[PDB]
Amino acid sequence: AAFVKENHRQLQARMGDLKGVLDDLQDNEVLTENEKELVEQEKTRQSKNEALLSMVEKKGDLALDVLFRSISERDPYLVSYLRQQ
Amino acid sequence: AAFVKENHRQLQARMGDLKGVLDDLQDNEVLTENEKELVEQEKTRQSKNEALLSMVEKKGDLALDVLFRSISERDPYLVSYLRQQ
Amino acid sequence: AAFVKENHRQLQARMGDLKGVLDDLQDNEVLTENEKELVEQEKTRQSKNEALLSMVEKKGDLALDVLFRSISERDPYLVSYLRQQ
Amino acid sequence: AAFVKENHRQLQARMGDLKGVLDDLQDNEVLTENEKELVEQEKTRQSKNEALLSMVEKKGDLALDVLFRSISERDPYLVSYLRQQ
Amino acid sequence: AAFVKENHRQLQARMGDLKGVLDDLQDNEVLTENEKELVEQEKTRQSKNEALLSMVEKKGDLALDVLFRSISERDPYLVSYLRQQ
Amino acid sequence: AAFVKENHRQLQARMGDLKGVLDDLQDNEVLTENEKELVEQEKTRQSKNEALLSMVEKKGDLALDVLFRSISERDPYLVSYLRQQ
Amino acid sequence: AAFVKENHRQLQARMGDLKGVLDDLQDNEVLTENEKELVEQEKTRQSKNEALLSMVEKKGDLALDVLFRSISERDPYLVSYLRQQ
Amino acid sequence: AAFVKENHRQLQARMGDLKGVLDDLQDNEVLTENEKELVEQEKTRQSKNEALLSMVEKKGDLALDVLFRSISERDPYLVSYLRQQ
Amino acid sequence: AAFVKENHRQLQARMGDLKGVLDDLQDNEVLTENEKELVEQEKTRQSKNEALLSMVEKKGDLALDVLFRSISERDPYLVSYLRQQ
Amino acid sequence: AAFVKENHRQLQARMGDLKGVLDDLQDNEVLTENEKELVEQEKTRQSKNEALLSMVEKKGDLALDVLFRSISERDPYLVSYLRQQ
Amino acid sequence: AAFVKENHRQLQARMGDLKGVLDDLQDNEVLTENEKELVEQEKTRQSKNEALLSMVEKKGDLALDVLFRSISERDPYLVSYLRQQ
Amino acid sequence: AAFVKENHRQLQARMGDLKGVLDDLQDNEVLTENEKELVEQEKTRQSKNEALLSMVEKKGDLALDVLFRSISERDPYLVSYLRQQ
Amino acid sequence: AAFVKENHRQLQARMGDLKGVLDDLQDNEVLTENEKELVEQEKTRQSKNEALLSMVEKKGDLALDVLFRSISERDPYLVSYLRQQ
Amino acid sequence: AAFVKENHRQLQARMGDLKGVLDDLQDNEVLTENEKELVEQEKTRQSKNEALLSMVEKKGDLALDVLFRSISERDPYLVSYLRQQ
Amino acid sequence: AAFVKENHRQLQARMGDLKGVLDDLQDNEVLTENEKELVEQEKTRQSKNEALLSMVEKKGDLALDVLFRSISERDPYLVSYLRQQ
Amino acid sequence: AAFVKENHRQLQARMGDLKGVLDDLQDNEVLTENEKELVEQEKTRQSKNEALLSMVEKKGDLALDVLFRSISERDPYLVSYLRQQ
């Protein structure tokens, strides 16, 4: 959960396909449809990553934990890379 | 209802998409169209949160309760995060 | 692993059939099905190579190593050619 | 090895039965089965020659040398004709 | 022309996009550029409607007629709705 | 016509492709080109639905009837679902 | 009909050729041509499945039933697999 | 049924004539004509094997069992070879 | 001409060799070369039938009549089968 | 020329391959390359038809005549169908 | 130059793609980059046309002539249509 | 410098974007930040032009010359138009 | 606390967004809502800074300390810059 | 740090994508979220550059140094161009 | 380097595939990934050319030289054509 | 070279096998591999002809001459037919 906070910049510059994590967050009620659509209407992938990351940090640490779990299963290689550095 | 008052600053710094809560408040007659439009014409999201929060506290505690319910359903994760701290 | 980074342009201009490496990466959980499909829906082979290479560098160096191994077994002649130059 | 590069057009317009060279390249790990099959599924013999030649130049100069050896043994008359002109 | 006067409140609460009527009034010399700009610098749509309506009633009944014509062509459905009630 | 009013929230959360209804409303003079364009320049589909619905309620009940007819032909399944509940 | 809702994620990750179900839905007026085309212009099969599933849930439960019937006849093995788990 | 899953790569690299298994799957309603045709329009035999295998795993484990039976009767030697290793 | 419309699904699932009807339609100016080529570049025969049928219904009923005549002469047995059922 | 105006909806719902008419309009200076590209970047064929039709009506009646001629030669069957109804 | 003034309303309701004329005006020093950007940040095409037209009339008649030339070359059909009416 | 004085009314009714001239005047110490902000807090563009023009005439003729230079470079077309009349 | 007094002019000419400090002062009962509103209704930012600074010095040194703390957290860079000079 | 001051006008007219520098400044506590949002809500890129530059000069020279570093890494070519002139 | 400036309009109307030059500029640190993505998200090829050209002129003349070199190698025929005219 | 321009439509409707001319253009550096691949990924032969012709006209007249030579040798009969008419 904190790991997201210490890795905000790397997560924006590295996270790729957001459809998986967005759907997982939606199904965990972290994000409503409107919130997800707002995330997706950004022009650039770094912009989309910033939108998603900020929207989730504002939700608190529990939701940050849910996001971290969803990334760790949707993209375990990046999570592991960051966590060991 | 009080919970809003003890969490004014956190609610301004955390609340995100206000369209849901604004529409819910409108449909509960807490806010008229003009009031909602005045809330939305602020430049920044913290400014919008301040406008909405102040406009609702002035209405009394019953309306504060309606606002709290609307947040608890539109953004339950932040509500829960705050309530457990 | 680094060797991929020093040879980004050559690898895009030289790598050929990507089905082998894509399947190997999928089976090593570097890429999910969706990610692989996104790689394959590019129009041109240089575009496909760019998509795959960028998608893998973002994953970190461990995944870059997995990709390098998969190329070194799927197309050893190009790997050797580059590595000796 | 270079000789292939200076004679790309002549080699596409002259090379005939590709089964010998394709099998030799396969046994020298220049081409995998999938790569060979992709070469053979072209409609025309000039198309097949183009596919094979491009697929091999991308592999580097060492593989170009292997291809040249295989042609020089599978079709020495054309190789000699070109080399003396 | 009178119809505007008997429907001041409904016209403020119902009229929508004012660009059409403002341009028509400008081209009929009912409003100068400065007057139109003053109408548009109000914060809310009900405020803009009030500004425009008052600014036009002050001009007299002839200008009220011009405004009514411009609404009846720019937004005939609302005009008809009101006129039959 | 009323049915739209009792189902404002459901219609915003359910209505999908608006091109059909927007074109039908345009051809019934409920909406001018400018009004339609203003509806389409919203970021989100719920935002677009809100814009369209509000813009039409302001026009009166006759225009609400036209909108209801256009939905009942462009998307009869949702209309029927709502009407039986 | 509900079965679709409890199996949203599995249905997106499992459903295959959508031409059959799309045509059946079209012939049952669940989807217009435009809606079907919007479903088909997505890049990936999981994206297409998400588009179709969401577009149908919004239509209500009756249309969800029609979709379920069309899947149960177009792809009975997956339907049965899911229903027994 | 599982045996297919543990032997995905070997089954793609080993399975040969698919007409028998495709017809058997068709007659067991695992595959419709359209699905079978989509399998057959791939360029390469490894591509065809991948298409068929993925299309069947998505159908569930029961259909995987049907596919395994059809292979075990259409090509028992490969099945036995794999199963004893 | 109508008979085509009442038998859209059967005609897609039954029509076979389209070269005859495509050439006849071309010679009756129902289809230009480009249109015919677009019909032929579909992957599957049901896809080709759908493309042709839709492309012709859009042309009107006269062209549907021309198509029906061309089928009735190119494949009279299917036409008769359908017409008597 | 008018015929286009009385048949706007039918022309959007019926017109098919637009490459012919777009090229003809380009060569008659009705459309510049940029305008044609803007027409082609729409997602759906009805969207493309709407874009083209609106872009041409705005140009005046002479350009509408040019468009009608180009359709009458590129797709005479639909033109005739509409004109006789 | 005057022709623009007598056709202000038609030019706002008819002019389409403004990128060409905006770039031409920029290269003729009628508009600076900031002015062009201000024109482009309007929401609607009629709004953009109004902004551009007003911004140019204020510049005088010489600049109106430059704008007219740029339209007459970027969109000659509309210019001709208007000029003959 | 005088030219500003003989063209006070035209300059208020014609000058457009003031950001350029305001910044230039600031950098030439004709206006301090406070003075510039006071100019910008007027409601209307004619009001802003009046404020700026009066504030500069009061400064003397040298500052009027600086303002004229800044307009002649920021908006040469209007300057030329006026100067030749 | 004194530091504010020795830096009155610099603090008026440097302090930027006052919303943070105003809210902090309000929550520390240094300023009532009316006082804050009076601060915000000034035209210019230097005027707003003067109003706030004077209103706080009049309150005494304890309130000056509260204001200094709020600036040091809301805008630490300016505070540090001044304090080291 | 000074280099920013001697190049204020060039930096406003040249700086491009501000997302990088804004995020870097945020992470160096030069700018709070509110300040960054205020910078981004300007209409034009020159306006955004002016807002950012002024907001940073007010912070002092240390923050100007941080901004210069962030530009020198986010856009080294422009920095170098200016510094050598 | 200047040659780009004297040929801005021709370069926007002539430059074709931008992937090569964009990648070369990226590898020469003229453009970051975000900048390149912003260039690619434009709708039209002339729009993309304008975005790239403006983004590079702002960087200075050295970067303009890098861009010119990359075009002269990626598309030498157009460069030569322009340079001799 | 011009002859291509006066015969754009005929050349798109007549040119046949493009492999010869594409390879010749590649070997004359008129087209890079990526450009050639982009030409070949069009669906229809008229589309491919349009892509190639436009891509070459943009390159200038020298490249148009190279293309004309390559056609005159790869397909002399069509060239002669057109040139004598």
Author numbering:
A (entry chain I), B (entry chain M), C (entry chain E), D (entry chain A), E (entry chain N), F (entry chain J), ...: 451 to 535
Task: Give sentences from the paper.
NLRP1 and CARD8, two related inflammasome sensors, are highly expressed in a number of cell types and play important roles in both host defense and human diseases. NLRP1 and CARD8 mediate inflammasome formation through their CARD-containing C-terminal fragment (CT) generated upon functional degradation of their respective N-terminal fragment (NT) by the proteasome. In general, inflammasomes leverage supramolecular filamentous structures to nucleate the polymerization of caspase-1, which in turn increases the local concentration of its caspase domain to facilitate dimerization and activation. Here, we determined the cryo-electron microscopy (cryo-EM) structures of NLRP1-CT and CARD8-CT filaments and analysed their assembly and specificity.
Despite being included in the construct, no UPA density was observed in the CARD8-CT cryo-EM reconstruction, which instead only reveals the central helical CARD filament. Given the predicted 17-residue unstructured linker between UPA and CARD, we proposed that UPA and any residual MBP molecules must be flexibly linked to the core CARD filament. Like other CARD filament structures, the CARD8CARD filament also possesses a one-start helical symmetry, with a refined left-handed rotation of 99.1° and an axial rise of 5.2 Å per subunit (~3.6 subunits per helical turn). The filament has a diameter of ~80 Å with a central hole of ~10 Å. In contrast, the type II interface is substantially more extensive, burying ~490 Å2 surface area per partner, and the type III interface covers ~230 Å2 per partner. Because of the small type I interface, the filament structure looks almost perforated with visible gaps. Detailed inspection of the three interfaces revealed many charge–charge pairs as well as other hydrophilic interactions including R459 at type Ia with D473 and D477 at type Ib, K509 of type IIa with D525 of type IIb, E507 of type IIa with R464 of type IIb, E479 of type IIa with Y527 of type IIb, and E483 and E487 of type IIIa with R495 of IIIb. While the wild-type protein formed filaments when the bulky MBP tag was removed, seven different point mutants, one at the type I interface, four at the type II interface, and two at the type III interface, completely abolished filament formation in vitro. CARD8CARD did not form filaments until 15 µM, while only 0.25 µM was required for CARD8UPA-CARD filament assembly, an almost 100-fold difference. In the model in which the type b surfaces of the CARD8CARD layer interact with the type a surfaces of the caspase-1CARD layer, the charge complementarity between CARD8CARD and caspase-1CARD is apparent, especially with strong negative (CARD8) and positive (caspase-1) patches both mainly at the outer rim of the filament cross-sections.
